[PDB]
Subunit: 133 residues, 2 copies
């Protein structure tokens, strides 16, 4: 049901497998030769044989980064949903808290009253005939 405790737990648990693939591809990008991102390095290629391999390297870095940016974008959208979920839920919990407090004060009233009948009954139990005699 929404937006209940189980909902929140499931959404909380899908943050675990939001890491996973993270730091590895993150290290592939973390590296990446400087030649694939600095255009000013291009003047140093004086060989078509070398220039064509930078071309292929560059191509696949382009694919790595595009895919990763897609995953990151999705994770951020998920985090915003999880945020709204948390906020709605803490907001509901404050209500539940207020009502439970009231219920408890109602049961303390009931306990007081029962306690009162108890005390006065101890008095009232004498003052009556023990008709066995």
């Amino acid at each position: 049901a929404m937006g209940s405790t189980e909902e929140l737990i499931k959404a909380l648990q899908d943050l675990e497998n939001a890491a996973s693939g993270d730091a590895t591809v993150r290290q592939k990008i973390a590296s990446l030769p400087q030649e694939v991102q600095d255009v000013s390095l291009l003047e140093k290629i004086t060989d078509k044989e070398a220039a064509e391999r930078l071309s292929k390297t560059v191509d696949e870095a382009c694919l790595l980064l595009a895919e990763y940016n897609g995953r990151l974008a999705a994770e951020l959208e998920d985090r915003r949903q999880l945020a709204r979920m948390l906020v709605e839920y803490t907001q509901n919990q404050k209500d539940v808290l207020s009502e439970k407090e009231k219920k408890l004060e109602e049961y303390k009233q009931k306990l007081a009253r029962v306690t009162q009948v108890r005390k006065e009954l101890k008095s009232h139990i004498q003052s009556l005939p023990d008709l066995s005699l």
Copy 2:
């Protein structure tokens, strides 16, 4: 491991199973006859024997209400602690949110620089000799 997603999941699950015993003891208290809580009913007792049966009844209503109020006061302290956890956690999540936003924006920056190298490379390759005669 505090505090921390794992922490919150555990505290979250210990909320479902605090309502377990609820509705039955809650229902026994609900049906507590008026004779054990109204001191004004005591004068309708004109027989020591009926007053003593009442005395016993009253007594066990007293234990039912005291133990239930103890569990309830405890539940309320746990909910207040969960409140504090939920709130600390939504703040740390807003932090993580901002850092992930900046991180991604930096990876889109890197994507653009790579993109620029791709184009200038497509131009710069026909500027070199295909040595083959």
